[PDB]
Amino acid sequence: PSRLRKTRKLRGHVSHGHGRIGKHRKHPGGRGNAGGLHHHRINFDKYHPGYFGKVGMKHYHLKRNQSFCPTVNLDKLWTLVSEQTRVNAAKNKTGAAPIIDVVRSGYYKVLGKGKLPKQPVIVKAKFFSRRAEEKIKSVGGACVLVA
Amino acid sequence: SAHLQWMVVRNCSSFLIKRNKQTYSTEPNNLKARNSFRYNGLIHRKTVGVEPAADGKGVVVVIKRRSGQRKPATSYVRTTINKNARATLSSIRHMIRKNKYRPDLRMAAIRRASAILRSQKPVMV
């Protein structure tokens, strides 16, 4: 909607909202990121530190699939199975724990943020963190590995 | 709901007329013909309207019944009053005040009936 814009209100104002002294010229200051080291150095230093230079080792032919490894924390672990699964384990007189296969749910590594409910469970994953295995062990569960 | 339907048609309505810094409303049952929640002739569970008769004598006082709200074919009860000026206004006042049927529209209905009755007597030179 062009009717809602400043241009419809700036009719009759000679400068069109751009000043009489300094006017609206073509490109005062260069085009794009011009002069980021000379006359826009203050803005680049103030708001984008680290912008200039190289850091680290360059690696050619980076395949993002090789390092694909999504993670899920212990607090979202029990949502990977059904609601029926958890309650059936909690009321199970037999100490038979369910199996949570996080590879099936699309995750490879289990991280250890949060806390687990007090019921054992077998967790299958490609990787675990040290605190993740510690907390799964502490509820009587087991950490097993897959490939 | 009266308030909900009002929030729909308080500005977007076919009966609305916005003109000369005025706002009128032309639905059939609007006493005073003004665009207002109090006088809207379509959104209330009970409304009252005064119209001239089919012939050029008397009025037709119409009220909304309480049961057939979503059945507009039978939703209105029309009765014709064809008496003298004083007896007519007593019937309209009794219909509204005694029945407690929308008592806030008593004087608007009486004034509208007076306008219609006076508009029916012969014009002078």
Binding site: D45, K46, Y47, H48, P49, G50, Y51, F52, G53, K54, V55, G56, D75, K76, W78, T79, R86, G114, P117 | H3, L4, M7, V8
Partner: protein, 187 residues
Amino acid sequence: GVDIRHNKDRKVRRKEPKSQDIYLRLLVKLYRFLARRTNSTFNQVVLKRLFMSRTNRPPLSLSRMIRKMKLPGRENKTAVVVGTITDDVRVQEVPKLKVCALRVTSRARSRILRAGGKILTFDQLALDSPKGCGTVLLSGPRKGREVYRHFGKAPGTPHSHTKPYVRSKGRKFERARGRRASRGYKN
């Protein structure tokens, strides 16, 4: 003339909801009457929260509401939030809660009702307690938004930990000069 200043005369505050939602404006009408015609300051806070923008009405999770209702002496009180109540899958035991909210996620709704709880809209709350007696006026985290990570001091100033505006995160994106002592400086 008088020796005063007029640059602060007009107080900038919401006096009505910028929304055109009629269901919202109807209960804005209702709590405008309750605020005016009662001495309860609860109605005044609820009324002015009905004018606020969505960013000023952040969602309240289920875990946060359960935490506030667990505080001593808050039992048997109606949790009132002017905003959206949101399910949290990080909690496992939802207690019984009587709760009035502007809007509830369809999954948070099912868990509350399943636990024997009650859910009220603000028109049911007025008939429940017009003065807002026996209520706990909660709120979502106002500054829990991604914009606030960027606000504050400029990233290239000492002792500022504000997130810079970068199109990508990586070792090539704004990490060399001004970010380590080996490239210029660090501050």
